[PDB]
Amino acid sequence: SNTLFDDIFQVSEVDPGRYNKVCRIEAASTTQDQCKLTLDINVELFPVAAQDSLTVTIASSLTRSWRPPQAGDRSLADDYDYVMYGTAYKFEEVSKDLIAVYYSFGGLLMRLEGNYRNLNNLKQENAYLLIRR
Amino acid sequence: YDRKVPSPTGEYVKEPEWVLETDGVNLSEVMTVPGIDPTRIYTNSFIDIMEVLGIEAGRAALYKEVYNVIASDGSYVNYRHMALLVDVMTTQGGLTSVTRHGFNRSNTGALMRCSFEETVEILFEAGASAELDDCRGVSENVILGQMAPIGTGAFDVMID
Amino acid sequence: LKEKAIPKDQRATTPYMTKYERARILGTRALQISMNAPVFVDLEGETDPLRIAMKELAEKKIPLVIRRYLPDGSFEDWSVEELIVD
Amino acid sequence: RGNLMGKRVDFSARTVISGDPNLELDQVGVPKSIAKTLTYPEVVTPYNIDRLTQLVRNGPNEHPGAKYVIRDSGDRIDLRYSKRAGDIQLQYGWKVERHIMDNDPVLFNRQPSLHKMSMMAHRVKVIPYSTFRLNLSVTSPYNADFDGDEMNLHVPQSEETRAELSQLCAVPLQIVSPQSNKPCMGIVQDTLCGIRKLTLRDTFIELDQVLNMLYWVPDWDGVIPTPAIIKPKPLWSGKQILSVAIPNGIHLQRFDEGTTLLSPKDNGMLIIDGQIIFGVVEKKTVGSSNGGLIHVVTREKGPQVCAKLFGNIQKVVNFWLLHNGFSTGIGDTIADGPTMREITETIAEAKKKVLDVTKEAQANLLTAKHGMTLRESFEDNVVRFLNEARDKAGRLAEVNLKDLNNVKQMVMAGSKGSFINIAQMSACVGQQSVEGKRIAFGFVDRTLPHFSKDDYSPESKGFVENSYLRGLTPQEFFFHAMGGREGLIDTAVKTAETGYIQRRLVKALEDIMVHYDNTTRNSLGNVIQFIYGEDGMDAAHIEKQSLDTIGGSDAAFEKRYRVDLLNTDHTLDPSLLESGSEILGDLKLQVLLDEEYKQLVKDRKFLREVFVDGEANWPLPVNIRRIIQNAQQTFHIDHTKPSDLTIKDIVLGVKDLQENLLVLRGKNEIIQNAQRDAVTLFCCLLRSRLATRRVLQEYRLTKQAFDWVLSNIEAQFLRSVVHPGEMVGVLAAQSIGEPATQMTLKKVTSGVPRLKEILNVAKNMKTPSLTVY
Amino acid sequence: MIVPVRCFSCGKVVGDKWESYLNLLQEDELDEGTALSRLGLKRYCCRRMILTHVDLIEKFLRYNP
Amino acid sequence: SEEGPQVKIREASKDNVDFILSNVDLAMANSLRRVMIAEIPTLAIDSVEVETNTTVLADEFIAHRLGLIPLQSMDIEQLEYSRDCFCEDHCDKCSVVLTLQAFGESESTTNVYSKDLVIVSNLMGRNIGHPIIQDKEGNGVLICKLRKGQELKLTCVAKKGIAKEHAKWGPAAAIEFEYDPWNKLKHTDYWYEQDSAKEWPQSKNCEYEDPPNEGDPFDYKAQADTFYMNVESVGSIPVDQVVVRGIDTLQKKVASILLALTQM
Amino acid sequence: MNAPDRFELFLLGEGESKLKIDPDTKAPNAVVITFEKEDHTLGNLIRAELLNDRKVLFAAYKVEHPFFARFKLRIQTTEGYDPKDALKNACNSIINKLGALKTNFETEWNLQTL
Amino acid sequence: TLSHLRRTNTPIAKPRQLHNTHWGLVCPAETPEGQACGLVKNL
Amino acid sequence: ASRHGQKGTIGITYRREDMPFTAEGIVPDLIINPHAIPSRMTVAHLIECLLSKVAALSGNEGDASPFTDITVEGISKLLREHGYQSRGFEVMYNGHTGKKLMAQIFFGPTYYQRLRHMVDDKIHARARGPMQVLTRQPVEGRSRDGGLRFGEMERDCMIAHGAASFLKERLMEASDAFRVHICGICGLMTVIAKLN
Amino acid sequence: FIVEDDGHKELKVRKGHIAKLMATEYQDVEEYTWSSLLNEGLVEYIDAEEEESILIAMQPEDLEPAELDVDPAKRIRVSHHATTFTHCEIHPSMILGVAASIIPFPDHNQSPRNTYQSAMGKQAMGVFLTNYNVRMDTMANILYYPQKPLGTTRAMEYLKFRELPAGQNAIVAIACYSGY
RNA sequence: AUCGAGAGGA
Ligand SMILES: [Mg+2]
Ligand SMILES: [Zn+2]
Ligand SMILES: [Zn+2]
Ligand SMILES: [Zn+2]
């Protein structure tokens, strides 16, 4: 029920595509220079510009309904500022000791590449994503 | 015609080949010619292939013509349907056409055939020859207002 | 024409119950039901003769026999108890 | 043929049709006047007497009611005019002709009734207007519009008749059409355009609209799905809400020409356990297409689940769209200035090419291409240029249209529209044709009295540079009139020719019924086919799947199926089995695997000998491509644990599974050889999928899931078997008559005239040819 | 055949505007657009009721019975 | 002033009231618009008993016209629904009996205006059923025309009702209703071929809202509260009492809900 | 010739009651209320004001068919909150808002000069 | 009424489709559909 | 139907509240589907809307003759100078909610006609009644409370499903049933039968 | 119309004739009638066979000399490149029939659409005669409130369409809305 | 009512 991943990514490629409310971002980890990812970001909600520094986190909690945040008694699990919730749909193995994970947050896609989340990410629908400015 | 052929590696590849299309048709002499492959020739007329290359080849040429006219519109119908139609046109010696000449003059009952053409002359010739109708066909048991030998009536139901 | 039956041990027709014979069976049952005939199941609160027939069929309580006919004149007799339903 | 083969009947009705989404699929909006008219005889029984007595007491002038009452003596009792309208007390054995009521099964039919699927049962829903309402997804097997179309409704009069309607001619059973081996009904214009703009990446839904959308779906559990956005505002995706109607356990995998698993263009379509993961929804997915969502849901979950799937998608998408809106306007016909200048510069370059060719051919410097004369070479070189210019200008227009051009979005949805529509409305309507050639010379050596004689210019033989938006000139308008007249007359002729063709078809094959020995025959006892469809399978329960053993290189095939239990690097790695190291050596199993591989290579050569063109995608009964997914998700396989299968398990299980895929059941070697031949394609497929290396490496099955696969495959095979009694002659004649009606107009007789040369044996064919190799 | 009481799409009283309409362009020599504006008809849903209206009753009356 | 929905009125007349609704949810303003249109009772003619018709028109033509004439219904609340009352067909406390009698004496065409409707039933002292005449010349609304010798003689029993049962009771003309004119809320994707700015025009109310500057990102948790409305009346009820009685009618609907809950 | 009498849109008939309550199936603390002879006018307003309440998990309305004058509303609440109380309080908030609106409006109109 | 007053009929080799001579003497658009399309023309 | 081959029935009648509406408080008389536009290429409809709106505002008559040099661009200039959008869209509000329609909608006046086919003139149903004298069959025609022809095309239809009992009911129990006595020696309907 | 040499190729009609014609049309002097044009040799009667021997211009603006600035939204009419003229058409809109003269912009539709409308306009409800109240025909249907269209073909003026119209200017919105 | 001819409709 605790965090499964933490890293610091500096973005490299920003691409609006054909849309107007979303952007494909291709970012790379800093000083851990073998894990790279690509992510569909709602620009209207989190206006991620080019060449930024964004902290990326992956959680597994914090079925039943989703009641809206009722009061402060519902304590958030996020000092971050942009949170999504999706599902795994494939785990690609590009090369030996180089894995890739595939996440889908209801259309908005993410691909992550590297070999150091190995013990954490599973083929479980439960996968929260957190982004800090 | 960029025909598909297997390479020695097993992988298919398009091998281009030169093909000859005609504005006329005479099969009896074209295949018996040096320089060609008399095993791959095809005529868009099936009724010449029925005479030259036996009957099953004519059946296949007819089916291919039908599939061509359906594929012209991009449509696709399943092989059992056209196959039933074709092999019906071929379940006799040669091409039994689908006109008043062809299948129509069969002995398929007497009240059956009196519902397509020559509606009166058929009854006349059947009274003459004194035909006996099995009354197993659809149209006979329909005209009799009986439950026709259809899927629902392909059997009988008794008590234990 | 004389005794064109087939002994049960040696039969070759499809052992499943096709939608045509099944539909005719349900219809015969609904017919005799709708005209006040007894019922062979503790009916779970249903009144429609067709659904009564469907539940009876699911419970293998229909004493009807299908005489599957062939071209040669011979035939086969199959029980509703025999005929599998899928 | 006027009073015996077909006749007017009682218990009938007919009126105008209209579309109402809030009806399910197999419902029919029936007016109240009709239901006051039409009757159904019912027998008084202790199940119904309490209701039927009240029904009588209600009288005949308001629904629910009843009109006539029959006793055992047979004297009809007229409730409309009698003394005992309210005094009546029914003793048993009696009949009441009640008004047709809700959930009654009735036949709904459209003239002209060509398809077997155009006379379908329907469930009555009594509505307060005077039109037949129905679902928009049933416009396919009727070819209806709501433009004045009217249809007919017949009522059964016996309980077995109600059964025949509700169990054979019902709508949900007619989703899958035997012709084309694919569903006939699909998602239609309005729902489709909605489901597109609903499912974009960009389209996000707020809270209140999401909760209403959820409540709209009838069969809903109350689990408010977690949104895709959490922190700034809990937004949902159109996919994340749309998934709520797609039932649990539906998987769908499709790729569209650019489909990385990133889907950089949202192409393709992924559906995981009944939840859409990525990909736009358009006709390729939810349409009436092959292997779409209706196809899969109909095969897997059943007819009723698919009907409710129709209902739910409709009720959701129409709601969303109603609150988001859509229009067409003319702004969607105006491309940019520079685009229009490029368009007319292209047309001018085409005109100058034509004029160069003309002044060339006027100097007899024409290499008259072989086979055709001078003037024919010229006509081809000019018509080719004009049509190339038209299509190039249309492509320029479609390039310049923006993403929000509403016509472009109806094009992308597939609801209504094409590309050539765009080319004509905005770019260039093109050159018209009468009897094949250009606008003929009506006057002596000229087309119209406004031109010099002998004017072979593009502008004189019918070319229309001006798009529909700019405006046609008088001459061009008249040439378009000449073209459209030929269009109208060809339509009116080919319609009737198709009608007579199809009548001849039906009346030729009308008695062809699959008898109980699976031998297609007719009234005389003649045999047409000894096995129906040459495989004994129904046209329904058939899906297009790939014969994967064919195609690809030999060495890759060896890597994909060859297991050498006697090698270091060609054996099943112990990572894939508990019995990995134990099985090394053990020639007693390598003989079995060698036999497997010999049979597989035999089948490879066999298929490459049959399907010479190398096409593997072909129609077969059981879709293993989906059953493997069902297994991988039903027993929760993880691709990490070793299997618990001996190789003998897989091999002997397959080999005795083949021995149960019965089609014919006879006890003799002739019928047995017929059956052994008549499943050879399916068994080739089976081995191509259920291969030891392929099984244990590509889908790491357990024992439980494996035996479940081997039972469900037998089940679907025995269900896909064609059913004795099917009148296949009418079915085939219709399957070939309907798609012919939709045909119309490089020199050969193509379409209907080819058809009438084919059916009636035509010794004077208008275009024989001899393609020789 | 006669001037409607109210417009078909908004519901404003447009009948009282007819007798004036003619005399605004027949006496005051106005234009149809300005002679519609000066009457309080601004939304075109009302404008089209008085502009497109054909008073046929003037011909219906010519008949004696 | 009082707590809650604040209103700033811009222009007002006997014809239309143009104002601003402020600090309300959207659904409340929408419901108010709909109830202002077609749920406040008025009065108009619901039966026409014709005796002599020599006009060039039909009887039901003139009937349909008569139903549509606006009638003064300020004091409508003292009049009861014809279905509610106990009378046989219609009485004085439940209906108003206008009548009409015209004859074409003149050689010229004789018009039949609205003011020619003569009241017959007892008013019992209330402002009810006066044919509303807002013409600048005194003449009512033109019903029919007459040649020499063509007479008309009918009576009209006007009962109470609302615009749902038929649109003749419609007391509201056209409700201007705009909100977020700059579209700072992104409630609509503007269609464009060159620029969403130059092609669509500046709304009238754009001066009453603070312009957004292209630098500030989008206010993603703002919800619409400010609306810009205009109510036009036909004449049966003045513009003020239209919106007042519409609000009273919606509150009455909620009150009937609450008493049904009590019955439960 | 088959169309209803118009007044059926807003007047009940033959024991058709104004409100009917049904506990929802497959929902913890929830209810679906069949209104009768009401339209979007009341339904969307009640739903919005219910969504203003911070103790309600779920609230939404629908008109299953526009031929008929009816609309159903479903509400799911917290524990201890019989959803009828949430409906009551939302409705009373609506009525008080409308009253303050009418009062402010009469004030401003009397202030207006015409 | 005005169309019916100007309507033709042709009894019955391609007499149906529109012809270059029909310019100005016969409507190119106005004609019935289906049976006898192009036979019945309006000047 | 419009004046450009756009046929159409009336799906339903909406009251004025439910209807969408623009900012001016104007409400459509007609709501037609967009999808019927591009498969027919009726540009005169879409242009006519523009011309009618421009002439309705201006107070002139919209010259719509063919072969006149009327640009859509001049119409757009005019409709821009009249304070409207250039290509004829207009922001509309949903009538149920009032939430801005994300899609602005083509809105304008346009000529329409009422074709002579009313449903009350078309509707028809028959349970039982008059029957022909010779054929003992249901008579033809609504004017006589006639019956509907279960023609042989529809019979070809019903055969594919397998419903034989339905055909027997349709052909005898629904119409022209008859009971005939016959002889075993002479297989004709010549035998005499005194029933009572 | 007749084209001849005056100078050069010019039609025989002239603006003074239009002056006299419309001045006669206003008196509603020696009236200038269609017969006055015909008996003056300014107009001829060409049948189908005769037009095989003449060259007809379509618009009189084909007679100006030619020797730039243009509206790109205007239609693209070709330079006629002909100078051996004998006649000029009256007006091409006159090739249409009575029923296809009601459609606006019939040059902007697909000809099947115009034929379908030609056949449907004969069905429309409206005023067929001002004396419907006297004539007792078997079937009469009259539109309560006819309206003259806002889009008018010029040829309606001679078809009396704006005096006996048979339709109404419905406020049309092209929208997806509730799927009915 | 029977026969035949017409204009229309999907
Ligand atoms: Mg149609
Ligand atoms: Zn208006
Ligand atoms: Zn009273
Ligand atoms: Zn005898």
Side-chain angles (χ1 to χ4, degrees), chain A residues 5-25:
Chain A
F5 193 96
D6 194 334
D7 197 294
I8 303 166
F9 295 89
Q10 176 214 359
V11 79
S12 60
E13 193 168 356
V14 51
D15 214 78
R18 300 188 34 193
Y19 294 111
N20 204 82
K21 267 165 164 299
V22 84
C23 275
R24 174 134 306 189
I25 266 54

Side-chain angles (χ1 to χ4, degrees), chain E residues 1-5 8-9 44-45 48-49 51-54 56 59-60 63 65, chain J residues 127 130-132 142-148 150 162-165 168-171:
Chain E
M1 33 176 90
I2 202 185
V3 190
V5 182
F8 293 151
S9 308
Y44 44 84
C45 91
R48 49 105 176 208
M49 219 63 55
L51 189 41
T52 65
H53 175 250
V54 166
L56 284 174
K59 318 190 192 313
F60 288 154
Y63 304 87
Chain J
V127 278
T130 51
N131 66 331
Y132 69 87
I142 267 65
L143 219 57
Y144 253 70
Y145 287 100
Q147 289 180 266
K148 74 187 172 199
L150 287 162
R162 315 177 315 180
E163 291 277 3
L164 262 75
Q168 291 155 348
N169 287 231
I171 285 304

Side-chain angles (χ1 to χ4, degrees), chain D residues 8 88 118 121 129 198 221 270 314 343 399 407 567 650 652 661 680 717 746 756 770:
Chain D
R8 315 200 158 280
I88 195 46
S118 291
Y129 288 139
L198 177 58
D221 52 29
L270 201 51
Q314 284 185 293
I343 287 195
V399 160
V407 183
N567 188 282
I650 323 183
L652 252 53
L661 325 174
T680 319
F717 191 80
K746 288 177 193 167
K756 211 191 173 174
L770 172 71

